[PDB]
Amino acid sequence: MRSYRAQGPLPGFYHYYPGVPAVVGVRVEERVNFCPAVWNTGLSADPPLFGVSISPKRFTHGLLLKARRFSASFHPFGQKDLVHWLGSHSGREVDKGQAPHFLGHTGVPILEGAYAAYELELLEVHTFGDHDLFVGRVVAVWEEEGLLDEKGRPKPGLALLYYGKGLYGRPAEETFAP
Amino acid sequence: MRSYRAQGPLPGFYHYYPGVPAVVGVRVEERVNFCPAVWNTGLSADPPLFGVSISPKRFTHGLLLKARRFSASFHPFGQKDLVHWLGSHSGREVDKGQAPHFLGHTGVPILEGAYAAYELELLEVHTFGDHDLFVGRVVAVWEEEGLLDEKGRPKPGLALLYYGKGLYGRPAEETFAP
Ligand SMILES: Cc1cc2nc3c(=O)[nH]c(=O)nc-3n(C[C@H](O)[C@H](O)[C@H](O)COP(=O)(O)O)c2cc1C
Ligand SMILES: Cc1cc2nc3c(=O)[nH]c(=O)nc-3n(C[C@H](O)[C@H](O)[C@H](O)COP(=O)(O)O)c2cc1C
């Protein structure tokens, strides 16, 4: 097993991929923006907290600080092209608010087509190196009935997986219960 | 699309699954322990920071605070049984240090069989609800050449995926580039 000591950023920082990308939706007055974030993770069950790590270079970063509210939606593999487009263009140069969406109970924009989504209230923001972790509290939950099993898990094969550098995939249908 | 307002912990907090579980290895003196963490994510590229969210209820939590160093390894789906076993028993009742492993350059224990692994130095710890986020700086990288692609990602369909509540899977071998 090859090894090397870190000497700065890694040549490729993708050893822990693939991951489901969370589409972050944010609205400031009339302006709506969306941006996928593969650096996301649950942070607490009670209370339910979910975090997304966003670079200060993204237009979304400033919008999140202004709105203090956002959505995190999870999309089927069938929307790979839309998700990639949203992650390859900036709100500084194109109105991504034209992507089909609706407003949640708290007013956050949710990209249409998701099998599930969270409406979040921003609790804290922490800087870790070149990205800021936005920690949100889940205040509302959206689910496309029939796409999640009895336990709330997205059915096998439906989720969009990101491998980094524009490469996507999906889970196999087969599962295992050790 | 159905919706409801959060009224405490969610009936199911798995909407963002599946995810690759990071096997966290830690050593304090002679004692070695391992515990999978599906709540993990990259946090920075420059410098390379990686985080794992661990409940204070885990035996691993105390060990991390003492050692201030740990490993995060990523395993092929073929090791689903071992990973699940490590995440279904506590170091309070069983010595998980007997699981085949080796020590990295910094002395952290790395579970054998991984296609890739990081040796990390604990930088910061932040409490978010019922879990603490351990932010580590990558100081060494391990890779199993024959199991990775050109960019350091697990080969097609090799990654172990966790859906939550003891259910696992793997990626389809098909990849797409929009
Ligand atoms: C699948 C995917 C996952 C991504 N993950 C992240 C991420 O976790 N954090 C981030 O800051 N950018 C990420 N990016 C990059 C942003 O989505 C991308 O820079 C986007 O164009 C930013 O849009 P904005 O400037 O309107 O905010 C990701 C891109 C893609 C396609
Ligand atoms: C696949 C998998 C992923 C898990 N993810 C996490 C996680 O992110 N955070 C956590 O605190 N526990 C997680 N658990 C639970 C711990 O791994 C489990 O409680 C383990 O027995 C703790 O061992 P310890 O007491 O020796 O630390 C996970 C378990 C499994 C099986």
Q: Hey, what domains does chain B have and what are their CATH numbers?
A: 1-178 (2.30.110.10)
Considering only CB atoms, B128 lies closest to which of A6, A43, A104, namely: A43
The total of other beta-carbon atoms located within 10 Å of residue A108's CB is 27
Q: H helices then E strands: how many in chain A?
A: 2, 12
Distance separating alpha carbons of residues A72 and A20, to the nearest angstrom: 11
Distance separating alpha carbons of residues A143 and A78, to the nearest angstrom: 17
Asked whether the beta carbons of residue B170 and residue A169 sit closer than 8 angstroms, the reply is no
Distance separating alpha carbons of residues A134 and A122, to the nearest angstrom: 7
Could you tell me the resolution of this structure in angstroms? 1.2
CB-ligand 2 contact for B38 (6 Å cutoff)? yes
Distance separating alpha carbons of residues A90 and A13, to the nearest angstrom: 23
Q: Please give the distance, rounded to the nearest whole angstrom, from the Cα atom of residue B51 to the centre of ligand 2.
A: 14
The residue to which tokens 């990101």 are assigned: A162
Q: Which distant-in-sequence residues (6+ apart) come within 8 Å of A16 by Cβ?
A: B20, B22, B40, B41, B42, B50, B72, B74, B116
Q: Which residues of B touch A164 (CB under 8 A)?
A: 151, 153
Burial level of B81, CB count in 10 A (0-12/13-18/19+)?
exposed
Experimental method: X-ray
Token pair in block for residue A128: 């870790």
User: In three state form, how does the secondary structure of chain A look?
Assistant: CEEEECCCCCCCCCCCCCECCEEEEEEECCEEEEEEECCEEEEECCCCEEEEEECCCCHHHHHHHHHCEEEEEECEHHHHHHHHHHCCCCCCCCCHHHCCEEECCCCCEEECCCCEEEEEEEEEEEEECCEEEEEEEEEEEEECCCCECCCCCECCCCECEEEECCEEECECCCCECC
Counting ligands in written order, which one lies closest to the CA of residue B88? 2
For residues A113 and A50, the answer to whether their CB atoms sit within 8 Å is no
